[PDB]
Write a protein that binds this ligand. Structure first.
Ligand SMILES: O=CN(O)[C@@H](CCCc1ncccn1)CS(=O)(=O)N1CCN(c2ccc(Br)cn2)CC1
Ligand SMILES: O=CN(O)[C@@H](CCCc1ncccn1)CS(=O)(=O)N1CCN(c2ccc(Br)cn2)CC1
Ligand SMILES: O=CN(O)[C@@H](CCCc1ncccn1)CS(=O)(=O)N1CCN(c2ccc(Br)cn2)CC1
Ligand SMILES: O=CN(O)[C@@H](CCCc1ncccn1)CS(=O)(=O)N1CCN(c2ccc(Br)cn2)CC1
Ligand SMILES: [Ca+2]
Ligand SMILES: [Ca+2]
Ligand SMILES: [Ca+2]
Ligand SMILES: [Ca+2]
Ligand SMILES: [Ca+2]
Ligand SMILES: [Ca+2]
Ligand SMILES: [Ca+2]
Ligand SMILES: [Ca+2]
Ligand SMILES: [Zn+2]
Ligand SMILES: [Zn+2]
Ligand SMILES: [Zn+2]
Ligand SMILES: [Zn+2]
Ligand SMILES: [Zn+2]
Ligand SMILES: [Zn+2]
Ligand SMILES: [Zn+2]
Ligand SMILES: [Zn+2]
Lengths: 159, 159, 159, 159
């Protein structure tokens, strides 16, 4: 069973902008760029919402890697423990997706947390999805395509 | 309601020197230099105190970024937790402002703790300001211009 | 007294592949390569099992250094505490040997955990050895050649 | 009141060798080299013991910087907490002096723990000195020349 966020926040504009603000030394910038686009598009293909990439300033969905405290109330904590977090749609921090630089991330060719899967999960949150009780769902709390539960949920929110 | 430090320490000389001793890889050195000057000047414009920049040795206000233990009794602790500290006016460590290198700092163009705001708060301490009970104040314990409370407080001390 | 793993898992194929997926800045890549080969061969000479090195993709025994969370349920934790872990033979994570990048590793010419000894111990696990109660054994829980206990154990498992 | 180590271990040879095995990115290698020599010589001038520098392999007194676990039973722990440790005279680890790379060290021109003072204290241990109860002593547990207590203690031991 999928979940949304309390009060069911969602992007209400036809177009939502996103920006990859900071990268990881674990991967080429372009790899992160392509994987983020692939993640967004997985959700995008199921709903009447369009994403537009911006390379500077503020965008609706701010995506990036950071070490320690980084401007919100959920500072990262070094290697292990918390790995990432994302915020439900809304202004400011809303929609943003942050990844802890102190972990090891991979595109699949090395050791590490698979970035595509993690990004697809985090971006699910950025769009308004909560965690699912269905182990098959990308939105399941713990850890390729969206499951029926993920699709049902996102379409229910957008629709 | 603004606060000062116990015994209300303040710089008693007409001129107070400052030095940016160490920088962060998160930003250009010159950016940190300019933001520090801007922060000091925000307080400076309200009082009969003049700041003089020095680029070597000891200055009254020593400013810098550090990882872990760094020569005082308040070692930093890695990503998260403590982010920075500054000491009330006085000799030696007095007036110094230290920032934890293990966080992410920004000038506003990326993810991170906004350095200008953090520096303005920390330098407030370096000049003798304590924390305020007024949420509008730059000296409020948690997180652009100085509020009426900040101004009232600094002018009361100098003034 | 040597130990194996519950249910005594072992590689059942004549040839087992291995790959050094990630390295440490503490040593040249080639040094890690040579020490891994030496470690494997120490066990290899005692049993009817052959190792084949691969330099890309997946291999049966995936070996590497990582910081923090890295794709399994045993994230590393920064300097100190956990130093490494390896998994009993089996598919997927089975057989893999991971080393925490946040420690200092050496080939013997500097300060650090001796990589050859650590790798020989970890690879013992990758082959199906558990910890020994014999302090002379390379498989003893705490810390050059395999002891009689190590040999007896690996030969008992292979066989 | 100065202290020595239980059983009063000391170097019994006329010549004791030392090697700086690893350095810190905080300072030039040559700076660390010169400060170590200065520290040793401070103790050396008070006793009938001669120090000989070696640049490779093993020396009686192994000196270096390390992150996390590094080959002894006192792994470092990242920024803060433990900063350094040294072992009483003896074979193997005996006499060695280790410094945590995760702190900030300085030669006096920047922010950080003053390396000369820290090295003089640590090397005191490497020679057989324990902590002093005299706040004036370099061997006092918490923090330029050796005090009367330091001199009395080292001369009593040598001796
Ligand atoms: O999204 C973030 N997570 O929930 C955080 C909790 C943050 C809580 C939080 N929220 C808001 C603020 C602070 N903290 C936990 S996580 O370990 O980072 N998360 C587990 C599931 N994982 C998967 C799962 C399945 C798959 Br397929 C791929 N990856 C994605 C990443
Ligand atoms: O200044 C230092 N802080 O108080 C430290 C505590 C150190 C305590 C301490 N003092 C002395 C020694 C050791 N520890 C807390 S902090 O998180 O670093 N601080 C919060 C408020 N923040 C703001 C707030 C408002 C705005 Br606008 C911008 N930034 C500035 C930074
Ligand atoms: O192999 C891994 N270890 O057991 C881990 C525990 C992981 C437990 C674990 N297992 C699985 C998953 C998570 N955690 C402990 S360790 O400190 O990394 N280990 C001690 C012995 N050491 C030696 C000993 C003797 C010699 Br000679 C050389 N090196 C090899 C390394
Ligand atoms: O030497 C090491 N220290 O005692 C360690 C404890 C290790 C304990 C330990 N021993 C052995 C093994 C593990 N842990 C404490 S420390 O903070 O690293 N130490 C304080 C005094 N400091 C001074 C003091 C005065 C001056 Br002047 C300069 N520097 C030198 C450095
Ligand atoms: Ca983390
Ligand atoms: Ca946003
Ligand atoms: Ca911190
Ligand atoms: Ca000062
Ligand atoms: Ca570790
Ligand atoms: Ca495997
Ligand atoms: Ca430390
Ligand atoms: Ca020694
Ligand atoms: Zn965040
Ligand atoms: Zn989640
Ligand atoms: Zn400090
Ligand atoms: Zn403050
Ligand atoms: Zn692992
Ligand atoms: Zn083990
Ligand atoms: Zn040590
Ligand atoms: Zn000591």
């Amino acid at each position: 069973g999928y979940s949304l966020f309390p009060n069911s926040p969602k992007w209400t504009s036809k177009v939502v902008t996103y920006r990859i603000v900071s990268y990881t030394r674990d991967l080429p910038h372009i790899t992160v760029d392509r994987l983020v686009s692939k993640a967004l598009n997985m959700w995008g293909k199921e709903i009447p919402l369009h994403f537009r990439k911006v390379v500077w300033g503020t965008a609706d969905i701010m995506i990036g890697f950071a070490r320690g405290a980084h401007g919100d109330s959920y500072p990262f904590d070094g290697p292990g423990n918390t790995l990432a977090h994302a915020f439900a749609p809304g202004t400011g921090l809303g929609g943003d997706a942050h990844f802890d630089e102190d972990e090891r991330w991979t595109d699949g060719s090395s050791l590490g947390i698979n970035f595509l899967y993690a990004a697809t999960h985090e971006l699910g949150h950025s769009l308004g999805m909560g965690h699912s009780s269905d182990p098959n769902a990308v939105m399941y709390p713990t850890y390729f395509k969206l499951s029926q539960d993920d699709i049902k949920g996102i379409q229910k929110l957008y629709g």
